[PDB]
Amino acid sequence: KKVQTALKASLEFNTFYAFYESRCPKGGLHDFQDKKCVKCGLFTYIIYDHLSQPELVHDYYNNYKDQYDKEKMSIRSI
Amino acid sequence: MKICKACSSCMVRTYVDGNIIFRCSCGESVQGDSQNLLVSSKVYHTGEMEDKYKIFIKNAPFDPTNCQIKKDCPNCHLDYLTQICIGSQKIIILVCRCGYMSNRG
Amino acid sequence: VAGGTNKSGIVRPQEIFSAKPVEAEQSSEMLLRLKNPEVETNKTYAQEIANSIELITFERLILQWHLLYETYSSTKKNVMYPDFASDVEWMTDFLENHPLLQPPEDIANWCIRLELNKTTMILKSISLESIINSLRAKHPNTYIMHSVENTASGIPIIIRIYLRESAFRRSTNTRMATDEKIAVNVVDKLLNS
Amino acid sequence: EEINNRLLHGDIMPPIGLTTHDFYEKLQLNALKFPDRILKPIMNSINP
Ligand SMILES: [Zn+2]
Ligand SMILES: [Zn+2]
């Protein structure tokens, strides 16, 4: 049960951050003037590790989830 | 195309002073009003559109060579569905013999 | 064996020994080394530049295009194609949102209507303004309007490019070409931008 | 099977430069490779 729950959460986060790694939620591609993107609040050290600083992984995920949801079902339609 | 009202030929399209004039080889000339303002067209991804698979999706529950899935149909409450995968985006559609279609079709 | 990566048989050896031109190469590759050493170590920096370097033509963002013999209609009284007459509804919004983008005097009787593939705009992460700005920079002899980049499925995004009279002054070296053949060629060069 | 479940739930999202079909095939080809530990049962059965 715990394996299934943790795997579902991990897979959701991995898919979200593998989508928004070059994709910018504010359109186009990311603009890294630092570890942090300029158009968004994406840090470079969050894309691949979602466990060291989970709060910074739960903030970005919370910011661009609804749109992520609309985009996700837009490809999978028609 | 435009069809001549007398010889039923395909009239040739010419453009003059913001007007489209159809000239036939029989001498008949006509003016198009609205339905003739389409010079050319092209649609893309023709092998993956919805109109390409309409008959196939309609026939899918009856073809015995299609993949079946263990899922309840929300309409007739049959306990299996037909799963089809179309296109290069691998769109999954579940269809049932009753007429149910995921993607709301 | 796929197109662009064909390395089957002796295809690449034949490309070398026959001194075939670059247009005849089926598996051509290149290795690009970054300039900034700080960018060099970071993989997101390398990944963003690699995705920045990827040929997206305007043609591959299009679901369909229609070549219409229409001029500009500032009012609701001019004639349009019947299937696309509802496009005039978002035209008025385009005027009310672009005070400095006004339609000029030299607009011809030629319109190319474009239907954007919203899935490709999402999968490739391409904004509407990136397309519009790229088209306006490369094609100064056209007038471009578009709908809103809406987020609701079933409401499409429409690109409409009105040609200008200067587009029909350029083609003089081939004097046996009418405006229809010129406008089609302009459509071909718009798609390849 | 887990990849197929993600495909059925629309949870497979390709990166830039790949279609969903190509990314799904890349996932399936990588998932169906024998691990290095396949030789443990082989070397347990044999006397070198
Ligand atoms: Zn960003
Ligand atoms: Zn049913």
Q: Which of C133, C91, C137, C134 is nearest to C111 (CA)?
A: C91
| Residues C55, B16: Cα–Cα separation, whole Å | 40
Where does residue D14 rank: exposed (0-12), middle (13-18), buried (19+ CB within 10 A)?
buried
**What are the φ and ψ backbone dihedral angles of B3, each rounded to 5 degrees?**
-110, 125
- Within 10 angstroms of residue C123's Cβ, the number of other Cβ atoms is 23
* Distance between Cα A41 and ligand 1 center (Å): 7
DSSP H or E segment with residue C187:
helix C179-191
Tell me the ligand closest to A39's alpha carbon: 1
Question: Touching check for C179 and chain B: CB below 8 Å?
Answer: yes
Q: Which residue in A has a C-alpha nearest to residue C128's C-alpha? A: A27
Nearest to D10 among A18, A23, A72 (CB): A72
Pairing mode of beta strands B40-43, B29-31: unpaired
The first and second tokens of residue C46, run together, are: 């390398």
Cβ–Cβ of B38/C66 closer than 8 Å? yes
Question: Touching check for A78 and chain B: CB below 8 Å?
Answer: yes
| Residues C192, C145: Cα–Cα separation, whole Å | 19
**What are the φ and ψ backbone dihedral angles of B85, each rounded to 5 degrees?**
-130, 110
* Distance between Cα B42 and ligand 2 center (Å): 37
Which residues in chain B have their CB less than 8 angstroms from residue C109's CB? 15, 18
Question: Residue C106 in contact with residue C164, Cβ under 8 Å?
Answer: yes
In sequence order, which residues have a C-beta less than 8 Å from that of residue D13 and are 6 or more positions away?
A15, A18, A19, A72, A75, D20, D23
Alpha helix (H) ranges present in chain B?
54-59
Contacts for B2-10: CB closer than 8 Å, 24+ residues apart: B2/B30, B2/B32, B2/B36, B4/B28, B5/B30
In sequence order, which residues have a C-beta less than 8 Å from that of residue C7 and are 6 or more positions away?
C1, C26, C27
| Residues C67, B35: Cα–Cα separation, whole Å | 13
Counting every residue, how long is chain D? 48
User: What distance lies between CA C61 and its chain's CA centroid?
Assistant: 7
Tell me the ligand closest to B97's alpha carbon: 2
Method: cryo-EM
- Within 10 angstroms of residue D1's Cβ, the number of other Cβ atoms is 6
* Distance between Cα B55 and ligand 2 center (Å): 18
Question: Residue B35 in contact with residue B44, Cβ under 8 Å?
Answer: no
Number of H helices, E strands in chain D: 3, 0
Question: Touching check for B17 and chain C: CB below 8 Å?
Answer: no
Cβ–Cβ of C68/B39 closer than 8 Å? yes
Question: Residue C131 in contact with residue C58, Cβ under 8 Å?
Answer: yes
Q: Which of A26, B81, A35 is nearest to C45 (CA)?
A: A35
Q: Is A2 helix (H, G, I), strand (E, B) or coil?
A: helix
